[PDB]
Write a protein that binds this ligand. Structure first.
Ligand code: HEM
Length: 291
């Protein structure tokens, strides 16, 4: 498969800045979701899940085709709880009917990170909705109950290296696990809707205990009331992952720079951009526009 980026007809930077503004204004407004965490966290998880289906070997899956819109992908067990991010974005799609689903679902993740005080993420437009029979089969997204060798091998299918995996996993300072969605329960840290390097600091500084939860799964619980998954804990059990965790724990700007590069790569995998295509857009925040 080749998937060529095609700009929605007649749209410029200012049109996309309006879809960003509408998502950011509705984040501000619906601040009560999930005990006042807000929709920022589930929106960056939706953007990583519609992107994480990509297979570098045959170019199937990934964000291009917007296939989460179809029943097979939408009802994937690994996607449980993302229906709330969908429902949030749906009024926005009725208001800007011209934007493709992949461009909307992926820009939601970009808007969420930047409005949570994260780094600026360059974003490119051009994904095109593809038909229901291009929807990927369930089972391409990663299990939580596994080790650093599984993690390295999984992210090789999206050709992410070590540094990109550790930077990307830093998004697990956001939001929380919910028993009914994934069989895991608890927050990651204290500031769960502001983007910081907290994930790395907690993994290196907390006294973690392995315990079973009410779903019979194991997780790593700390005295402070925070939790982490076996796959997160992996990043300090592996010596190559561990020196990068340390690096981000000591330098949040280096972490913001590397997360920005790796998250844009994740969102752009499987997509070919012609060089007549516009440069990646850097969107201004509500606060930068005085709105
Ligand atoms: C091996 C990798 C990963 C695994 C196994 C994994 C697994 C999970 C699980 C089990 C949850 C909790 C879902 C729930 O109950 O609601 C979760 C939440 C989350 N994950 Fe990951 N994750 C991985 C990678 C990533 C990456 C690369 C990103 C983003 C760049 C990400 C972003 C998030 C976010 C923001 C949440 C919080 C969602 C919320 O608060 O509702 N994850 N992840």
């Amino acid at each position: 498969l080749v998937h060529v980026a095609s700009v929605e007809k007649g749209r410029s930077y200012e049109d996309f800045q309006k879809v960003y503004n509408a998502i950011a204004l509705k984040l501000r407004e619906d601040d009560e979701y999930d005990n006042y965490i807000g929709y920022g966290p589930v929106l960056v998880r939706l953007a990583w899940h519609i992107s994480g289906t990509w297979d570098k070997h045959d170019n199937t899956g990934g964000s291009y085709g917007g296939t989460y819109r179809f029943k097979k992908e939408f009802n994937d067990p690994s996607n449980a709880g993302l229906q709330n991010g969908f429902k949030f974005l749906e009024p926005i799609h009725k208001e800007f009917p011209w934007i493709s689903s992949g461009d909307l679902f992926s820009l939601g993740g970009v808007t969420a990170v930047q409005e949570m005080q994260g780094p600026k993420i360059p974003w490119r437009c051009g994904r095109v909705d593809t038909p229901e029979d291009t929807t990927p089969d369930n089972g391409r997204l990663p299990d939580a109950d596994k080790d650093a060798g599984y993690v390295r091998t999984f992210f090789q299918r999206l050709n992410m290296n070590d540094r990109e995996v550790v930077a990307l996993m830093g998004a697990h300072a956001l939001g929380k696990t919910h028993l009914k969605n994934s069989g895991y329960e608890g927050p990651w840290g204290a500031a769960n809707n502001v983007f910081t390097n907290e994930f790395y600091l907690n993994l290196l500084n907390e006294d973690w205990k392995l315990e079973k939860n009410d779903a019979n799964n194991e997780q790593w619980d700390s005295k402070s009331g925070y939790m982490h998954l076996p796959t997160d804990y992996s990043l300090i059990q592996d010596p190559k992952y561990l020196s990068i965790v340390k690096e981000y724990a000591n330098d949040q700007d280096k972490f913001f720079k590397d997360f920005s590069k790796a998250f844009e790569k994740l969102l752009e995998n499987g997509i070919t951009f012609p060089k007549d295509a516009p440069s990646p857009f850097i969107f201004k925040t509500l606060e930068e526009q005085g709105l």
